[PDB]
Symmetry: C2
Subunit: 39 residues, 2 copies
């Protein structure tokens, strides 16, 4: 169970980093869309 | 440790749900942006 826990924490951290990267990409794309929607 | 694994799995599945939702949102928004830019 300790072996389960260690890589479970590792993959949770990796998924959190991926979530942060995806959120940053969403922010960038929504700023781009807001800029383009002017005209 | 069983409780730790339980809420770690809960947070994990929430993470994949958020990742899937944001990925599909990015796909649709990029498709819309490309279609609008094509004009």
């Amino acid at each position: 169970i300790e072996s389960d826990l260690e890589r479970a924490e590792e993959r949770a951290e990796l998924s959190e980093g991926k979530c942060a990267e995806l959120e940053e990409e969403l922010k960038t794309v929504t700023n781009n869309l807001k800029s383009l929607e002017a005209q």
